[PDB]
Design a binder for this molecule. Structure first.
Ligand SMILES: Nc1ncnc2c1ncn2[C@@H]1O[C@H](COP(=O)(O)OP(=O)(O)O)[C@@H](O)[C@H]1O
Ligand SMILES: Nc1ncnc2c1ncn2[C@@H]1O[C@H](COP(=O)(O)OP(=O)(O)O)[C@@H](O)[C@H]1O
Ligand code: ALF
Ligand code: ALF
Ligand SMILES: [Mg+2]
Ligand SMILES: [Mg+2]
Ligand SMILES: [Zn+2]
Lengths: 302, 31, 293, 35
């Protein structure tokens, strides 16, 4: 059967691009920090970068130290770095190196700038060995992941306007770069999308639709983290027991819907999970599955 | 089953579940 | 400052009510609840709940299917919902562009067009528009881009029909910056990530001259009246003490974590009462267990 | 103190908290007090 953990991914020697996504507030940032820590600890000789594409960044807030537009090592890690894409700065730099304010607040500019960052890595490919993306909630991340296509068409159309309105070299460079990205993003050994959800109707239904959308783009998804589980069958109050009954109802559907996926069940801990120490502690259960009987005390150990 | 065999099998099974009208069916079973 | 939204629920001036905050805090749940309360309180008025989250949840919340064209909520006479599918909307305009249907920002562009459409219908005395629109917004970062749009666009700006858009942008900017007409209700949970994000969000909104005077603190345990719950309440209480101080000039509405998800008109209605008359853990405790299916 | 007077007082108070370095001060209060 399908191991209920991310060990295969954590030990992958092929993946270059790992997206962590799903509904708002389900634990994308927490999980993406966790996966990254596990990858860096499991593969000491490789360099990892965790990039936030959520315009409302939380990497700094989760680790409790200051990251920004320039990649920077996580304090206490030899081989993990974080970057929080900064649009103001990014556009300020473009303006200097060649308005930048007014386009700096245009809806879509965040996804545009995030993708541009991907393009820079590709061009240096020809660094970090693997990039993990802590993505924006579902709706806007799908727009980002549509970019390779949206973009090749826009560039084609842009070239048509130019022919009519009397440079081809740069369009081709741009198009070639987009193509490399599309090729890599649709290669199962190079990129995967790990979904995060909670065991509730709104999250489950959104996760299924997200996954269908991803598969239709030929993006790989083989892993789902189900977060914030109560495991109240393992001194639990009336509220916890009723809520766990709900969680189990959806967990049963999840087990059937995603029987072909790694389904990784993670506990709600007795506090928020912040700082390297606590994130690492939590992260162990992505590698070796949480067992409520034996590991139960860890949720109080923050 | 080898590591590589299991990987290809699951890939195919995951894919098959969304093929044809699989996706639409999955949505209905959720709703 | 009363710990409820009663003043907003019974307002006779508001046309635009945004509901926002960090992901998963309860924007959709709260916006439904606020909308239900207003519709129940003002039967003579028609309310539209619109989702600007591209990953729509209004249909999932109520358990019936909505779309780009307004449809009344089953069991209400004066509450409707809207969820725009950019690909459909654009196809209808084309009939009346798949490039554009998946361009990042297209969601905020169409949400904005809908607002402009409503403004125009009203200025033109069309008999069937809504009195008040409640926005169930996307999580913080993109909702700020949306709210930045009136100004960003205002700067950016056949050419006549260009300046016709100019005048509409200005009309929206005028209304969004009028505290009688427009307000933004923050939703948060009592945890550091959400707290810090909420304060930054509010500082941005105020810099836009958008009114913010109310905050919903959701998913509260109130455990002082199970070791996990006891420890998590201690955490929530620590941030709750900060919230009380920070937002002492705001309506701070404290909502309980219920013993299940809140879906369907009946359950959302039952939850919503506590936006109008503040929840009392000792008195109303039983209610968190009264959700149906 | 009528509701109109109170509404106006609260509004002035809210705005003042975000004026004159009060904004950065509030942020420091949140981060400064966090673990
Ligand atoms: N399993 C968990 N147990 C306890 N707290 C959690 C867990 N997963 C996430 N959190 C907390 O819940 C909140 C939302 O998680 P977060 O990673 O910010 O979500 P997302 O990035 O998807 O918005 C944060 O306050 C985080 O500390
Ligand atoms: N006070 C509450 N008690 C129980 N469940 C809640 C409460 N508030 C929200 N929910 C549930 O929590 C999840 C997130 O709420 P939701 O409204 O989708 O969030 P947001 O719209 O901010 O993403 C949903 O499954 C919803 O039913
Ligand atoms: F995850 Al949401 F609105 F559905 F923040
Ligand atoms: F609310 Al988030 F990533 F911080 F969905
Ligand atoms: Mg996050
Ligand atoms: Mg929502
Ligand atoms: Zn409990």
């Amino acid at each position: 059967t399908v191991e209920p953990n991310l060990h295969s991914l954590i030990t992958s020697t092929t993946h270059k691009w790992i997206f962590v996504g799903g509904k708002g507030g389900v634990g994308k940032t927490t999980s993406s920090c966790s996966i990254a820590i596990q990858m860096a600890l499991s593969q000491p000789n490789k360099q990892f970068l965790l990039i936030s594409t959520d315009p409302a960044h939380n990497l700094s807030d989760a680790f409790g130290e200051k990251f920004g537009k320039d990649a920077r090592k996580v304090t206490g890690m030899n081989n993990l770095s974080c970057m929080e894409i900064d649009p103001s700065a990014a556009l300020k730099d473009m303006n200097d190196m060649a308005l930048a304010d007014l386009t700096g607040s245009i809806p879509g500019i965040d996804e545009a700038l995030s993708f541009m960052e991907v393009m820079k890595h590709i061009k240096r490919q020809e660094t970090f060995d693997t990039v993990i993306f802590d993505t924006a909630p579902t709706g806007h991340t799908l727009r980002f992941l549509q970019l390779p296509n949206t973009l090749s068409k826009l560039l084609e159309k842009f070239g048509e306007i130019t022919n009519k309105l009397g440079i081809s070299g740069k369009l081709n460079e741009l198009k070639a770069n987009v193509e490399t990205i599309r090729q890599q993003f649709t290669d199962p050994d190079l990129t995967t999308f790990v979904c995060v959800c909670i065991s509730e109707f709104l999250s489950l239904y959104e996760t299924e639709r997200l996954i269908q959308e991803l598969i239709s783009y030929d993006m790989d998804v083989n892993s789902i983290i189900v977060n914030q589980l109560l495991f109240a069958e393992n001194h639990n109050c009336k509220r916890c027991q009723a809520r766990w009954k709900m969680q189990k109802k959806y967990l049963d559907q999840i087990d059937e819907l995603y029987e072909d996926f790694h389904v990784v069940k993670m506990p709600l801990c007795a506090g928020e999970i912040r700082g390297l120490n606590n994130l690492t502690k939590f992260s162990q259960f992505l590698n070796k599955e949480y067992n409520p009987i034996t590991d139960g005390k860890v949720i109080y150990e923050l | 089953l080898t590591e590589a065999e299991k990987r290809r099998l699951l890939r195919e099974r995951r894919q098959k579940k969304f093929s044809n009208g699989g996706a639409s069916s999955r949505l209905n079973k959720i709703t």
